[PDB]
């Protein structure tokens, strides 16, 4: 696995020792090369995981996420080139290094074989994120947003540390393979209930469960574009990956302990989609849409059926791509009008035609249009939940309807109508932004030809 | 309240200094080369060659192997009269039931 870790580390001295006219170019070149190399990790075996060594391993769950991170880093660089153009060279290098450290930490989380190493790195991801959100954010709310995010994550994760150490002491090991083979049923005692909670709430905070989701809108709104990109694409899927990894040792107590979280997510999807129906900030609308989409992944993980896990993996990948692209489009609009108000700039379908097509395709993917992987994941989760209980279909259908409603409402409000008269600074879209949207969309559409790659280890 | 610089004018359009901009930086040459690097290493390499590599990836999921084994097993079961799929994932003769 070091074939990906070592170049990621070498990115730092490269950027630090590169000329001020070549940081972005070199970073993009070698991040894209790293993604190309990490594409080799998709050759997963049917039954056994790829055990590179004692410390790192990868299965059909880790590989798609690793590829997504290695692919998203260049996209973040391209999106963050614009506003970080008048910054000094040292701060640009610092921002690039923060992004690289975040990517490295994400890789080592998705490849870790030890639960405690996974925890260490998955909590280490906070520091680069928090710095990015509180240092290069534009608003004055970036300070409160960073605190909310950091403290929600830590208050969720510290009991997870306690529980992991307790499990290490009792079972003797935290290795995923051993903890999977030497698995044992959990009794219905209060101690097991609280161990289950300690293991679950940490990831429930990460992928925002309805009620613990208040940090996501602040974090996604106040952070810069690249920060929002990671937070939406990978930092939310961290919780899902952790939950899918740890649910092995949390049975059969889950059957009875999942009801509160299942109900919370199945109602919060509707609540957050309705909130999206009545949002005035584009980034806030996208963040609440992300909450609504991750509610389905939470449900799928808490049901623990093979179709649910496949749908969860597919939805994670698809939602990461779609949310990142939506945030990039909103960033372009913001950099054009210097405001995040949705109703401020209207009739953009007549001034930026290709950007309108990008918005249309992104919204279609967001509302789970067949045969996109978004729909593949959503339909798999819906079938799994229907098998779990037939009543679930009502909430699932209502959520789908409201998602289509608010996505098309965003499309109509932004890229339709009469152009805003007074706004005169809307210049023709650059090649960089269009290339960013194309690099967001094309892998997403291509994955529908080979959906088996992102369907998880249970395919 | 303070001696501070007036707010800088909204980001100057890179089209002003060079109508061909491609976004990115301000120097036209580095703009052209950054655009070439991005397009090449994004579409021509990691997209095209990436999709071809992931499309012709060797079948280590053992799907064709599983299908061939299933065909052989079905042949054996039907030819010899065996009831296709048994009803026990493990032989009962090796289970010491309480």
């Amino acid at each position: 696995m070091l074939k990906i870790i070592i170049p990621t580390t070498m990115l730092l001295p490269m950027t630090w020792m590169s000329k001020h006219n070549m940081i972005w170019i070199n970073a993009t070149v070698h991040s894209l090369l790293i993604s190309l190399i990490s594409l080799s990790l998709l050759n997963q075996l049917g039954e056994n995981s790829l055990n590179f060594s004692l410390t790192f391993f990868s299965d059909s769950l880790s590989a798609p996420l690793l590829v997504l991170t290695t692919w998203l880093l260049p996209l973040m660089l391209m999106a963050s080139q614009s506003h970080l153009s008048k910054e000094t060279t040292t701060r640009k290098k610092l921002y690039i290094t923060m992004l690289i450290l975040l990517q490295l930490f994400l890789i080592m989380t998705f490849t870790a074989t030890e639960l405690i190493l996974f925890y260490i790195l998955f909590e280490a991801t906070l520091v680069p994120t928090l710095i990015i959100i509180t240092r290069w954010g534009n608003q004055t709310e970036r300070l409160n947003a960073g605190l909310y995010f950091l403290f929600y994550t830590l208050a969720g994760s510290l009991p997870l540390l306690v529980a992991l150490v307790y499990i290490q002491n009792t079972t003797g090991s935290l290795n995923f393979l051993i903890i999977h083979y030497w698995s044992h049923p959990l009794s219905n005692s209060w101690s097991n209930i609280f161990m289950w909670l300690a293991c679950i709430m940490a990831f429930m905070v990460k992928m925002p469960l309805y009620g613990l989701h208040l940090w996501l809108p602040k974090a996604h709104v106040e952070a810069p574009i690249a920060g929002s990109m990671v937070l939406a694409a990978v930092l939310l899927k961290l919780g899902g990956y952790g939950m899918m990894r740890i649910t092995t040792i949390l049975n059969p107590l889950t059957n009875y302990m999942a009801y509160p979280f299942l109900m919370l997510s199945m109602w919060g999807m509707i609540m957050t989609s309705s909130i999206c129906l009545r949002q005035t900030d584009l980034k806030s609308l996208i963040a609440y849409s992300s909450v609504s989409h991750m509610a389905l992944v939470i449900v799928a993980i808490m049901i623990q059926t093979p179709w649910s896990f496949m749908g969860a993996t597919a939805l994670m990948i698809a939602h990461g791509l779609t949310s990142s692209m939506l945030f990039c489009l909103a960033n372009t609009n913001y950099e054009r009008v210097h405001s995040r108000t949705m109703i401020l700039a209207r009739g953009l379908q007549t001034l930026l035609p290709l950007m309108a097509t990008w918005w249309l395709m992104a919204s279609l993917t967001n509302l789970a249009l067949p045969p996109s992987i978004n729909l593949i994941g959503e339909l798999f989760i819906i079938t799994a939940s229907f098998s779990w209980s037939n009543i679930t279909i009502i909430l699932m259908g209502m959520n789908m309807m409201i998602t289509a409603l608010y996505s098309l409402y965003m499309l109509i409000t932004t890229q339709r109508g009469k152009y805003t008269h007074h706004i005169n600074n809307i210049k023709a879209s650059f090649t960089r932004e269009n290339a960013l949207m194309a690099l967001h969309i094309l892998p997403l559409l291509l994955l529908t030809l080979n959906p088996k790659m992102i369907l998880g280890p249970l395919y | 309240i303070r001696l501070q610089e007036d707010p800088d004018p909204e980001d100057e359009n890179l089209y002003e200094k060079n109508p061909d901009s491609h976004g990115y930086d301000k120097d036209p040459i580095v703009d052209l080369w950054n655009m070439r690097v991005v397009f090449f290493f994004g579409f021509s390499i990691v997209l095209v060659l990436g999709s071809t590599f992931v499309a012709y990836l060797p079948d280590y999921r053992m799907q064709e192997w599983a299908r061939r084994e299933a065909e052989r097993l079905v042949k054996y079961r039907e030819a010899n009269g065996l009831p296709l799929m048994e009803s026990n994932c493990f032989d009962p003769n090796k289970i010491q039931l309480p």
Partner: peptide, 14 residues
């Protein structure tokens, strides 16, 4: 347009 970059009113809170 620029980052908020604390002013005197914010700084005098600390």
């Amino acid at each position: 347009a620029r980052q908020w970059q604390p002013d005197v009113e914010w700084a005098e809170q600390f």
